[PDB]
Amino acid sequence: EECIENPERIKIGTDLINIRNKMNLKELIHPNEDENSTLLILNQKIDIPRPLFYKIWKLHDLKVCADGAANRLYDYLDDDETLRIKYLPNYIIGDLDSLSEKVYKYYRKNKVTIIKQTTQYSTDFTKCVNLISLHFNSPEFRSLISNKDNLQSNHGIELEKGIHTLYNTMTESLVFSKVTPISLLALGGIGGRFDQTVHSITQLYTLSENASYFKLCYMTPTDLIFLIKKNGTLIEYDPQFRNTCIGNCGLLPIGEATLVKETRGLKWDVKNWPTSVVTGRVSSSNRFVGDNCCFIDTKDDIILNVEIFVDKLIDFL
Amino acid sequence: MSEECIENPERIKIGTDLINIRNKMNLKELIHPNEDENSTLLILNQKIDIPRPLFYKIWKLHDLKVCADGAANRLYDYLDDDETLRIKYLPNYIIGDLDSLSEKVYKYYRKNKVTIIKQTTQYSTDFTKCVNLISLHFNSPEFRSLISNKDNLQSNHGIELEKGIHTLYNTMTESLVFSKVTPISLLALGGIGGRFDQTVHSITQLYTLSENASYFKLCYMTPTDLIFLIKKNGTLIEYDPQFRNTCIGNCGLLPIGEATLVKETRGLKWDVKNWPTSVVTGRVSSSNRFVGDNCCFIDTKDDIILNVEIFVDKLIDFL
Ligand SMILES: Cc1ncc(C[n+]2csc(CCO)c2C)c(N)n1
Numbered sequence: 114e115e116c117i118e119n120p121e122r123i124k125i126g127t128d129l130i131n132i133r134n135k136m137n138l139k140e141l142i143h144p145n146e147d148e149n150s151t152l153l154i155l156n157q158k159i160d161i162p163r164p165l166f167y168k169i170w171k172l173h174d175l176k177v178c179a180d181g182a183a184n185r186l187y188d189y190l191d192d193d194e195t196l197r198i199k200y201l202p203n204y205i206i207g208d209l210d211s212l213s214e215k216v217y218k219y220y221r222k223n224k225v226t227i228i229k230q231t232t233q234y235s236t237d238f239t240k241c242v243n244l245i246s247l248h249f250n251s252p253e254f255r256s257l258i259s260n261k262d263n264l265q266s267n268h269g270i271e272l273e274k275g276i277h278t279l280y281n282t283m284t285e286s287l288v289f290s291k292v293t294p295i296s297l298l299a300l301g302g303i304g305g306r307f308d309q310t311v312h313s314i315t316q317l318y319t320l321s322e323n324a325s326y327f328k329l330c331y332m333t334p335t336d337l338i339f340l341i342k343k344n345g346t347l348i349e350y351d352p353q354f355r356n357t358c359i360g361n362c363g364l365l366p367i368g369e370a371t372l373v374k375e376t377r378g379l380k381w382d383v384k385n386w387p388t389s390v391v392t393g394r395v396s397s398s399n400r401f402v403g404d405n406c407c408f409i410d411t412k413d414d415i416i417l418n419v420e421i422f423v424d425k426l427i428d429f430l
Numbered sequence: 431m432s433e434e435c436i437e438n439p440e441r442i443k444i445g446t447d448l449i450n451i452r453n454k455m456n457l458k459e460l461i462h463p464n465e466d467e468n469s470t471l472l473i474l475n476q477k478i479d480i481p482r483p484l485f486y487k488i489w490k491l492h493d494l495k496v497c498a499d500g501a502a503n504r505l506y507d508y509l510d511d512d513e514t515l516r517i518k519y520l521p522n523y524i525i526g527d528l529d530s531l532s533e534k535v536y537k538y539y540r541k542n543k544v545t546i547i548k549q550t551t552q553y554s555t556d557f558t559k560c561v562n563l564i565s566l567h568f569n570s571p572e573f574r575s576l577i578s579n580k581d582n583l584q585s586n587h588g589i590e591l592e593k594g595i596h597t598l599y600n601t602m603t604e605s606l607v608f609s610k611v612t613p614i615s616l617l618a619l620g621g622i623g624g625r626f627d628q629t630v631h632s633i634t635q636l637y638t639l640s641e642n643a644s645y646f647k648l649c650y651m652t653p654t655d656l657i658f659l660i661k662k663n664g665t666l667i668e669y670d671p672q673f674r675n676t677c678i679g680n681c682g683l684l685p686i687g688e689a690t691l692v693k694e695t696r697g698l699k700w701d702v703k704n705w706p707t708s709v710v711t712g713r714v715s716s717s718n719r720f721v722g723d724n725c726c727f728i729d730t731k732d733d734i735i736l737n738v739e740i741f742v743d744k745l746i747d748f749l
């Protein structure tokens with residue numbers, strides 16, 4: 114077991130390391146050419162800079178609002194009516210009790226596909242991810258949504274848990290490695306009601322295991338939160354992008370202890386280093402020192418948070 | 431022995447049927463320290479947003495007040511307006527590397543005799559620096575003498591600059607009889623909701639203090655929650671009905687850091703039995719709520735974190 118404090122900037126070597134997976138930070142926000150994409154807005158006040166909002170909105174195909182998130186979007190775009198009508202979500206799903214009559218009427222009038230789901234056994238997040246998957250991976254569902262003589266009866270979706278029932282039936286045959294990836298960027302899932310923050314984190318683990326085609330990343334006023342796969346992952350980033358938009362970072366074994374076999378490119382690199390929230394052994398306030406990449410090899414998947422300077426982001430997207 | 435989950439009506443009464451209660455606690459005690467125990471209000475480095483009337487009360491309800499490095503700036507600005515109040519709410523200590531400390535803020539608190547301690551080690555968080563300091567303050571008469579003696583003209587109050595507070599803490603802990611240490615009711619502000627890795631660190635403290643400094647009773651107060659640790663094997667959460675109805679919302683059983691088993695719960699809208707819970711499997715009771723008239727029972731195999739939604743602007747009347 115060891116920990117070393119490195120120089121502020123280095124170029125990591127590749128000798129003696131097995132790079133099993135590679136990922137680019139920018140791609141967490143800017144979806145790949147031909148993979149599906151979705152911007153998910155959860156129920157929490159939006160405060161991301163307007164310019165950045167416009168940018169990520171354009172970079173993503175589908176836009177989904179989680180129940181009360183519709184209120185959030187409506188109030189967020191409160192300085193110009195022409196802009197509010199320019200950014201309409203494709204779907205709004207949830208029990209709909211959180212929606213104000215004013216907001217419901219606005220988006221209904223503007224043809225947004227509103228789906229009601231009463232079940233109290235699934236979070237709005239799950240309702241949203243099930244919907245998003247069906248949208249892209251179920252031809253039958255798409256035909257259901259696009260048909261006339263349906264949108265006056267909840268679009269032909271069972272009121273209680275239809276989205277889950279349809280999702281379950283579909284997923285039974287899907288082979289994740291053969292499903293087109295879905296670049297999912299989520300807003301508002303962190304920093305509010307704490308149990309919701311924890312649930313959002315669980316999504317990073319469950320999706321990776323039960324719906325691997327999803328590539329989820331949370332964007333908050335201060336961080337990018339995503340999952341890193343075990344056994345050797347190389348995090349890549351343009352030097353200028355990193356120096357101008359990135360701050361500190363943290364390796365977070367949330368919900369499960371694990372072992373950090375080896376890291377390369379962090380201000381404080383570790384090897385054969387046990388990590389756990391329970392023991393307090395967690396690399397927090399760390400930071401990238403690798404010029405254009407950092408290597409992290411953990412025994413089990415772990416969560417990584419990368420501090421961002423949102424006001425600088427727009428220039429590199 | 432079978433896994434079960436039932437949906438209760440909005441209000442029920444739990445019993446003492448067979449179960450075994452290993453710990454009892456009242457939600458109000460998380461904010462209002464008991465007369466016989468020590469208390470501390472810890473302010474971490476995050477913008478303060480708590481309502482003023484409540485702040486004044488929580489401040490009055492706690493003995494020691496500690497600011498974690500930049501937290502001094504936060505407090506200073508929080509009271510931008512009345513100098514009378516600002517002077518009235520001076521922290522007892524300010525500890526950390528102090529680089530983020532505003533030159534203006536540093537001068538103000540130093541002039542007003544706040545005990546400022548510098549610690550440069552980058553191998554411990556400001557949080558750990560604070561709790562070590564807090565324990566020394568209450569449990570080490572020698573530490574108090576070190577910072578109080580007037581013959582002591584050594585810089586930094588005679589505390590070794592790199593990791594003195596930890597060294598002193600470790601030494602004290604060696605001769606400390608934990609079973610006889612006066613409890614320390616610790617309420618923290620600003621440890622949740624900002625930089626995510628810090629939110630996670632704040633959570634580790636609940637587990638580590640419970641294991642290595644059990645005399646501490648830590649609870650986080652955020653704009654929306656009270657976050658604290660629930661000991662394993664049966665904990666009874668108590669609350670006055672009027673208080674619960676006026677200031678309490680939903681709640682969640684969070685197995686942050688390690689999966690466990692929810693042996694049984696009584697008094698939750700959704701009660702469970704032999705119910706495995708894990709952040710990795712996604713099996714986490716979120717958006718739950720109390721339905722027990724005056725109490726809720728939670729029995730887990732291992733300690734877990736509980737968050738109780740609060741309506742901050744309503745608290746003051748019950749504190
Ligand atoms: C064991 C257990 N705990 C909590 C809930 C409640 N719940 C879960 S998702 C949701 C809607 C908002 O996320 C609600 C109310 C449950 N059904 N089962």
Ligand SMILES: Cc1ncc(C[n+]2csc(CCO)c2C)c(N)n1
Nearest residue numbers: 381396397398399552553554555556
């Ligand atoms: C493995 C490992 N990760 C991160 C740090 C850095 N660090 C830890 S506490 C702190 C000060 C802010 O809390 C800093 C910079 C380290 N030393 N070792």
